[PDB]
Design a protein around this ligand. Structure first.
Ligand code: K
Ligand code: K
Ligand code: ZN
Lengths: 304, 55
């Protein structure tokens, strides 16, 4: 829920609901969550997406190694500008680890607790959850929710050593990255077919099912919703002033990264909060957000 | 060599050949191999089209 600072109307002659974009614009500001195949590099995958949709630009998020499968968000065209925000939320993986010597289930559970929290790797990374999914002798299958940048291969080795033996990662599959989950993932074959269905059968249904608006990958950020009259200015480099805000998230703290959205829910840009939610609510003047990157094309909304 | 499995129904990950919470034979989570060649693409799309103007 957002706090309303000022009730304002939006002009439906400009922009639109992110999920109701014309097909070309959905692609322009879209993201395809690919279920990465075992074998190709993450770069080969973004390249394929680029070729499949006949795009000029595409980029993936958290790099997955060649043998790793799973959630691999691939930003399309303008959406590539949003990739830097994807590392913020935690990631999750299912991993198959092979111990050098068998260990009891009780000792594994104990060590998982020991690793739950802050750990060190070459950096301090946080391990939010570590769950034992299944075990068969030296083969241990576990789920891990962790901070971006955490090397799972190294985590398996350290867990092996903590058990009094050694271990190596056998298989890894990412189930969550950024705001995307496995349920959002699509096979490249289905993305290819979706495109063909649009280009041939003139049907956008499949493309709309597989391409998500970039706003979907920015849901973890607190928001500052601005009036229509402030949008184009922001797209041209202006910061967000108190008087241009219609609604905002509760608990925004100074220095916090926030998403600037239109009244229709379109991502305009991201920046650092210069004031907290209350100051913004009490102020009648001042600069609310120091804009750091613009996502929306100039001229989408009216210049004032 | 052990390989992780996943239940096609519950979507749970396990090492068992049969899900312990549902019943169906578990499957390998890996996505089908892909190539721009899209060898059987025509047939695959043929099926989707037919299946769609039906159920
Ligand atoms: K990512
Ligand atoms: K064993
Ligand atoms: Zn099941």
């Amino acid at each position: 829920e957002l706090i309303v600072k000022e009730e304002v109307e939006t002009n439906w002659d400009y922009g639109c609901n992110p999920y109701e974009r014309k097909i070309e614009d959905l692609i322009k500001y879209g993201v395809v969550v690919v279920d990465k195949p075992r074998g190709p590099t993450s770069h080969e995958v973004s390249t394929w997406v680029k070729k499949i949709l006949n795009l000029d630009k595409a980029g993936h998020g958290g790099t997955l190694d060649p043998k790793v499968t799973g959630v691999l968000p691939v930003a399309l065209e303008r959406a590539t500008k949003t990739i830097p925000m994807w590392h913020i939320p935690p990631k999750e993986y299912v991993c198959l680890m092979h111990l050098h010597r068998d260990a009891s289930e009780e000792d594994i559970l104990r060590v998982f607790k020991e690793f739950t929290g802050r750990i060190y790797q070459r950096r301090i990374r946080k391990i939010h959850e570590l769950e034992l999914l299944d075990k068969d002798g030296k083969d241990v299958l576990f789920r891990v929710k962790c901070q971006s940048g955490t090397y799972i291969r190294k985590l398996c080795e350290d867990i092996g050593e903590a058990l009094g033996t050694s271990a190596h990662m056998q298989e890894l599959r990412r189930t969550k990255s950024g705001c995307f989950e496995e349920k959002d993932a699509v096979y490249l074959q289905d993305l290819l077919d979706a495109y063909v269905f649009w280009k041939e059968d003139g049907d956008e249904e499949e493309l709309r099912r597989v391409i998500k608006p970039m706003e979907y990958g920015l849901r973890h950020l607190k928001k500052v919703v601005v009036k229509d009259s402030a949008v184009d200015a922001i797209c041209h480099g202006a910061d967000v002033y108190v008087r241009g805000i219609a609604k905002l998230s509760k608990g925004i703290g100074k220095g916090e990264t926030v998403l600037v959205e239109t009244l229709k829910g379109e991502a305009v840009a991201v920046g650092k909060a210069l004031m907290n939610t209350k100051e913004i609510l009490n102020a009648d003047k001042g600069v609310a957000v120091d804009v750091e990157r613009v996502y929306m094309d100039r001229g989408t909304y009216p210049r004032m | 060599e052990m390989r992780m499995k996943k239940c096609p129904k519950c979507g749970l990950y396990t090492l068992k050949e049969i899900c312990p919470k549902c019943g169906e034979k578990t499957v390998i989570p890996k996505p089908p191999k892909f190539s721009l060649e899209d060898r059987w693409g025509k047939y695959r799309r043929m099926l989707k089209r037919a299946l769609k103007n039906k159920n």
